[PDB]
Nucleic acid binder design. Structure first.
Lengths: 180, 207
DNA sequence: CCCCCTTTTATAGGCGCC
DNA sequence: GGGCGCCTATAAAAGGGG
């Protein structure tokens, strides 16, 4: 055991309202809405609790972003569906699904990326001219990690919380072996 | 239409000559291109983007790395797209390249700056030591090299400007100032023990 | 086939512009 | 020189537009 639990930072989920929508009306009536089709084809809405931001499409499908938990992402997703409902639309809540989860943590010691890239070239990409962090594409679980010399680590691409935890457990030993 | 390789080799040739690259490099580039092309590994991209990435790879494989900025300069493609293609190509060809080091640019940079061999060596030394002592963690090797050159040149009669170095190394002078600020505290321990200080280690620029 | 648009987030060196 | 704010990179969905 690493004895470290990576903290969930962002969850992206989708849900289908079932009925087609009219962004113009929504944008107009809804308070915290925003709609500039010239700029982006969807309505951008934001609730403060769960602190989130949503992307609502005229197709009826929407994207929920910003929640720090699956429970919270779904809650926000429902609140969004409600305001749409309340503005008079046959809004349903079909196929809610978590699409991506992001986690981050600190192994608490500096890392020798130079070394890690040497023995792990197969999964690594560390080009200082392109990005200051080492990009690790783990195969099992299919998660991408961003490793920094400071010891901070970011993990993403997860469909479920377990994948985040698993990937970190897999990488911890490796990282320890490259401690400065 | 695959004999569109000829047009790729022409373009490769063109780019290469703008910076006078030896033939081994151009040959390697052509091989890389041919291999990626025939593999049909990078669908949907522009041949010149792939060619420019191939060029960038070739210089690194042949042991004389050019910065993405330099390859960009002689190319119709952006750093961003060359970089994307670069990563995609290494994966398709199951290849890799050795991480870049300060030493990889010391020679050419110092030459372009018309710096006397003595300085070039000092810089090279300062950079290597600096990294060994972990004074510039996280910084790009190009940045650290630029700062070392600056430090070295400022300790010599053949002094160079942050701006001059930056233009040749392709880094902004604040970027130079940042790494320089980090190595400055150990300036005495960084120069080669037998160094002819035109300007004493102390009177060195105190950015 | 690919990229862009936009949103969110941790992370962080480099750099345009005032 | 000083420092803000955006670039670069990661994943992913939405649905066009190119």
């Amino acid at each position: 055991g690493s004895g470290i639990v990576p903290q969930l930072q962002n969850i992206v989920s989708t849900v289908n309202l079932g009925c087609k929508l009219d962004l113009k009306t929504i944008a107009l009536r809804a308070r915290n809405a925003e709609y500039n089709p010239k700029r982006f084809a969807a309505v951008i809405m934001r609730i403060r609790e769960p602190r989130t931001t949503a992307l609502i499409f005229s197709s009826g499908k929407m994207v929920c972003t910003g929640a720090k938990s699956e429970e919270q992402s779904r809650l926000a997703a429902r609140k969004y569906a409600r305001v749409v409902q309340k503005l008079g639309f046959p809004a349903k809540f079909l196929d809610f699904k978590i699409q991506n989860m992001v986690g981050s943590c600190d192994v608490k010691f500096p890392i020798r990326l130079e070394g890690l890239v040497l023995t792990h070239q197969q999964f690594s990409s560390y080009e200082p001219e392109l990005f200051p962090g080492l990009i690790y594409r783990m195969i099992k679980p299919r998660i991408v990690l961003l490793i920094f010399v400071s010891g901070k680590v970011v993990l993403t691409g997860a469909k479920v919380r377990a994948e985040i935890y698993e990937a970190f457990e897999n990488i911890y030993p490796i990282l320890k072996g490259f401690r400065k | 239409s695959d004999r569109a390789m000829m047009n790729a080799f022409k373009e490769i040739t063109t780019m290469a000559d703008r910076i006078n690259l030896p033939r081994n490099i151009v040959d390697r580039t052509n091989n890389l291109f041919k291999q990626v092309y025939e593999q049909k590994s990078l669908k949907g991209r522009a041949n010149d983007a792939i060619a420019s990435a191939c060029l960038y790879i070739a210089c690194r494989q042949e042991g004389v790395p050019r910065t993405f900025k330099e390859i960009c300069a002689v190319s119709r493609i952006s750093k961003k797209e060359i970089g994307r293609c670069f990563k995609l190509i290494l994966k398709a060809l199951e290849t890799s390249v050795d991480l870049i080091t300060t030493g990889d640019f010391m020679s050419r940079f110092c030459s372009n700056l018309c710096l006397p061999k003595q300085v070039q060596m000092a810089a090279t030394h300062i950079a290597r030591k600096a990294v060994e002592l972990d004074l510039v963690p996280g910084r790009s090797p190009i940045s650290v090299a630029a700062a070392a050159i600056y430090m070295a040149s400022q300790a010599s009669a053949e002094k160079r400007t942050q701006k001059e170095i930056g233009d040749i190394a392709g880094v902004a002078d604040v970027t130079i100032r940042q790494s320089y600020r980090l190595i400055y505290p150990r300036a005495p321990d960084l120069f080669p023990t037998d160094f002819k200080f035109d300007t004493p280690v102390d009177k060195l620029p105190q950015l």
